[PDB]
């Protein structure tokens, strides 16, 4: 019951299979290939969660055999955007698998996101955004952490993916091992493009301090902090 | 007596002024604008060190009034390359000032470099390279940390510059605050271009582990580790 879809048109179909693993039949992608899913609650437990991005039936790693997602209407998502629209923060304690066609995934929760032993399977790029998506005329324009002071926390059990990883938040507190092909962390109060180009920045009213502890197992690490004066402690 | 030039044609003229600050009349730049200085010993104390890159007399921050460097013959260096050619490691405990025309600076010491309260003045880019420069047909081609396991250490008193900073070593151990406009750290056993593009990498015989502790006060931080398996601990 960790994932609860919004009641409206962008709420995906969510169920649980054997062992408590959640299966999310994501909503129909738009013409850009974005499946924009809205949630009252987005949390992943140790049983994990599977996003059905499949055009044909097959075997998922975490939830066994699955049919194609009938919501897709013949075109898989290129980006699975998971947006929390309530005030509830997110806790990610297990793996998120894209079943079917590999895609990018974004979780946007302006109330906070905590990872502790979370991970991503069959995702080319996985982004955690303590912030909101920006839309113009029905198209995704980017993301915003403006006027937000909440935290992206990574716990002692770390985060693992074989793909790229983006960490976007007013501040980040990491205490475990982050394993990814590349790690990109952007801190401070910013607006971003869809590809996480920083488009604008603002000086926070108080200090927004980011703490990385633990370790980073990745060949390429980039940390960009725009909070003038605020630093990153190591 | 911390800086001792090589006796040959690339040894600069080194003296000390009031308070022990060293003044280095760097050697004539080549046609690329590289002043290639070779040293038996390169160490900077709390009184600091001034590199005379001036075409006219004026006031240095650390050593008072100085004449133009007669070695320049009317053209200032674009890059001041300081190469230790002995087996002696380097200790940097004070500020390095470029007097006159701002330039880039590189210290290359394959035996190890330790910074503790060091810094750079009037330098657009400052690089510390635990490795050797590579030359072909008399021209600088890049740098190499191949077959080297030595350490770039940054102590509790940190490192400060208002320009760009490059840290290049088989492994890095940092325990203090690094302040720079941008920080770029490349670890592992690699060959580099003159602009620190990684051109090749090799797997070390044993693990080369890099430890950043302390903090990084910079808007842009990049860490690239090519030692497959070796990570960066935070």
**B223 interface with A at CB cutoff 8 Å:** yes
Q: What's the gap between Cα A107 and its chain centre?
A: 3
**A180 interface with B at CB cutoff 8 Å:** no
Q: Do A234 and B222 touch (CB under 8 A)?
A: no
CB A123 within 8 A of CB A82: no
Instruction: For residue A221, give how far its alpha carbon lies from the nearest alpha carbon of chain B (Å).
Output: 5
**Beta strand B220-225 with B182-187: parallel, antiparallel or unpaired?**
parallel
Q: Where are the alpha helices (DSSP H) in B25-156?
A: none
Which among A214, A219, A231 has CB closest to B234? A214
Angle at B227 between CA B221 and CA B231, to 5 degrees: 60
Instruction: For residue A142, give how far its alpha carbon lies from the nearest alpha carbon of chain B (Å).
Output: 21
Here the tokens at position B59 are 């006031």
Q: Do A221 and B233 touch (CB under 8 A)?
A: no
Q: Count how many domains chain A has.
A: 1
The secondary structure of chain A in percent helix, strand, coil, rounded to multiples of 5, reads 5, 55, 45
The SS3 assignment for A56 reads: coil
Which residues in chain A touch residue B224, judged by CB atoms under 8 angstroms apart?
Answer: 219-221
Q: Do A233 and B214 touch (CB under 8 A)?
A: yes
Locate the chain A residue with the closest alpha carbon to B176: A234
| Resolution given for this structure, in angstroms | 1.5
CA distance A13 to A9: 11
**A181 interface with B at CB cutoff 8 Å:** no
CA distance B39 to B70: 20
Here the tokens at position B202 are 């090799």
Which residues in chain B touch residue A214, judged by CB atoms under 8 angstroms apart?
Answer: 233-234
Which residues in chain A touch residue B215, judged by CB atoms under 8 angstroms apart?
Answer: 231-234
Q: B 157-176 residues with CB below 8 A of A?
A: 174
Instruction: For residue B183, give how far its alpha carbon lies from the nearest alpha carbon of chain A (Å).
Output: 10
CB B107 within 8 A of CB B114: no
Locate the chain A residue with the closest alpha carbon to B180: A231
The SS3 assignment for B19 reads: helix
CA distance B129 to B143: 8
Instruction: For residue A120, give how far its alpha carbon lies from the nearest alpha carbon of chain B (Å).
Output: 20
Among candidates B9, B10, B8, B103, which has minimal Cα distance to B51?
A: B103
Buried b (16+ CB within 10 A) or exposed e, B148-170: bbbbbbbbebbbbbebbbbbbbb
Instruction: For residue A177, give how far its alpha carbon lies from the nearest alpha carbon of chain B (Å).
Output: 8
Beta-carbon contacts of B225 under 8 Å, excluding residues fewer than 6 positions away, are A218, A219, B186, B187, B188, B210, B231, B232
Kindly report the backbone phi and psi dihedral angles of residue B51, in degrees, each rounded to the nearest multiple of 5, phi listed first. Answer: -100, 120
Q: Do A222 and B222 touch (CB under 8 A)?
A: yes
**B187 interface with A at CB cutoff 8 Å:** no
**Beta strand B123-129 with A182-187: parallel, antiparallel or unpaired?**
unpaired
Q: Where are the alpha helices (DSSP H) in A32-122?
A: none
**A222 interface with B at CB cutoff 8 Å:** yes
Helix (H) or strand (E) run with residue A7 in it: none
The SS3 assignment for A27 reads: coil
Locate the chain A residue with the closest alpha carbon to B185: A221
**Beta strand A177-179 with A159-161: parallel, antiparallel or unpaired?**
parallel
Which residues in chain B touch residue A234, judged by CB atoms under 8 angstroms apart?
Answer: 174, 212-216, 234
**Beta strand A139-144 with A189-192: parallel, antiparallel or unpaired?**
antiparallel
Alpha carbon distances (Å) from B36 to A50, A128, A159, B9, B102:
59, 47, 46, 10, 16
**B98 interface with A at CB cutoff 8 Å:** no
**B99 interface with A at CB cutoff 8 Å:** no
In terms of phi and psi (left: phi > 0; alpha: psi -120 to 50; beta: otherwise), the region of B229 is left
CA distance B1 to B22: 8
**A207 interface with B at CB cutoff 8 Å:** no
Q: Write out the residue range of the structural domain in which residue B25 sits.
A: 1-234
Q: What's the sign of the alpha-carbon dihedral B197, B198, B200, B204? A: positive
Helix (H) or strand (E) run with residue B30 in it: none
**A214 interface with B at CB cutoff 8 Å:** yes
CA distance B39 to A131: 53
């Amino acid at each position: 019951n960790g994932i609860v879809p919004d009641a409206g048109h962008q709420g995906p179909d969510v169920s649980a299979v054997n062992g408590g693993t959640q299966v999310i039949n994501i909503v129909t992608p738009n013409n850009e290939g974005i499946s924009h899913n809205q949630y009252q609650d987005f949390n992943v437990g140790k049983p994990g969660a599977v996003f059905n991005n499949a055009l044909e039936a097959g075997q998922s790693q975490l939830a066994g055999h699955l049919n194609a997602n009938s919501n897709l209407n013949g075109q898989a998502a290129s980006l699975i955007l998971n947006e929390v629209v309530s005030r509830n923060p997110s806790f990610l304690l297990g793996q998120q698998e894209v079943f079917g066609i590999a895609a990018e995934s974004v979780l946007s929760n302006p109330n906070g996101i905590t990872c502790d032993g979370c991970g991503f399977i069959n995702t080319s790029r996985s982004s955690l955004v303590v912030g909101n998506p920006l839309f113009e005329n029905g198209q995704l324009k980017g993301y915003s952490t403006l006027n937000n002071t909440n935290l992206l926390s990574l716990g002692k059990n770390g985060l693992n993916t074989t793909g790229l990883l983006d960490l976007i938040a007013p501040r980040i507190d990491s205490r475990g091992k982050i394993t990814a092909a590349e790690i990109s962390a952007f801190t401070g109060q910013n607006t971003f493009s869809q590809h996480f180009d920083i488009l604008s920045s603002q000086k926070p009213v108080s200090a927004l301090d980011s703490y990385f502890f633990g370790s980073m197992q990745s060949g390429r690490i980039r940390i960009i902090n725009t909070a003038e004066g605020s630093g990153v402690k190591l």
